[PDB]
Design a protein around this ligand. Sequence first.
Ligand SMILES: O=C(Nc1ccccn1)[C@@H]1CCN(C(=O)CCc2ccccc2F)C1
Ligand SMILES: [Cl-]
Length: 345
Amino acid sequence: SKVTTVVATPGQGPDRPQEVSYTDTKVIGNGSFGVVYQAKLCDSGELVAIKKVLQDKRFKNRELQIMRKLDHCNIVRLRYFFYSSKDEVYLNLVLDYVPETVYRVARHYSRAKQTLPVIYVKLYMYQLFRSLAYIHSFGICHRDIKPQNLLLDPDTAVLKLCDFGSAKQLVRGEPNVSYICSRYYRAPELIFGATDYTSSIDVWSAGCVLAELLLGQPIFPGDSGVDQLVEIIKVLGTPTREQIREMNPNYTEFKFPQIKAHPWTKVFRPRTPPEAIALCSRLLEYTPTARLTPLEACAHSFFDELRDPNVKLPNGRDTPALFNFTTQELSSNPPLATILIPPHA
Ligand SMILES: O=C(Nc1ccccn1)[C@@H]1CCN(C(=O)CCc2ccccc2F)C1
Ligand SMILES: [Cl-]
């Protein structure tokens, strides 16, 4: 029956603080940056996650500034934020609580020697690509796409991208650090130490998630960058000098095993949908500019089942909102609306 009452600022809308009381506070992880609590809002009884992070006095929090601009069905919702306190200041991000992650669901299937039904692979990957299409339209790259950062409501099948702690607006000409993004999901250009990478690193990472959901395990594992590259070269083949330059190591000797392109069909298990494999090959490309855009991925034939008017979830419910595209979200390529928004929508 303990209640904490704070004066917190809404995430969206004008900077107008209000009194917010929450209860049933409990720790649900230490996210390196700080602690993450779960709580229940007294008024509505809705569950929230509170991400407590040490506030730098010098500059405003980049995660916060990005989160306040974002408003999308497939991105974790910032309800409130407030400051508290050691004698240092802590920023608290109050987020809509989502009970599961793709990581946890995938692992349950994995250690039961089962593959996740393709319907869920389609649903999760499509919603990820929508979230990426949205943030990329602002020039914002996530830079840490991985199964742990993909929240899931198992009932509604709604996926929400979270953890914008590494997220940044990439401006052509300005260099960016190459040591972001988690091991297994790092694009080759990042491994090669490129600082002139684009939002297409997120597409590579998304491709790694797709393959993982199909395979039941990470496609490019390895404790070192060298090990990872070998696993990449085993699938994609040895990168041509042309492809190397576009990834952008520049100065640093080449010298990889001269291995042939292992055909994509033999990578996955026998009855893996051909379109799933086709999609992978167009996401996991050496040349960054050669990779599909998020919006192009959404319109790929692998997701056709989702656009079928009779499609429903295995639990009987309707699919979540898949077609409520905005102008912002479609700006990369508006003509695609004729595929993305089907007749019945
Ligand atoms: O954290 C969650 N939801 C959430 C978090 C932040 C914002 C919205 N929703 C769920 C509830 C518990 N989850 C977990 O994966 C276990 C907790 C956990 C373990 C290790 C590292 C971090 C962490 F949060 C996923
Ligand atoms: Cl599920």
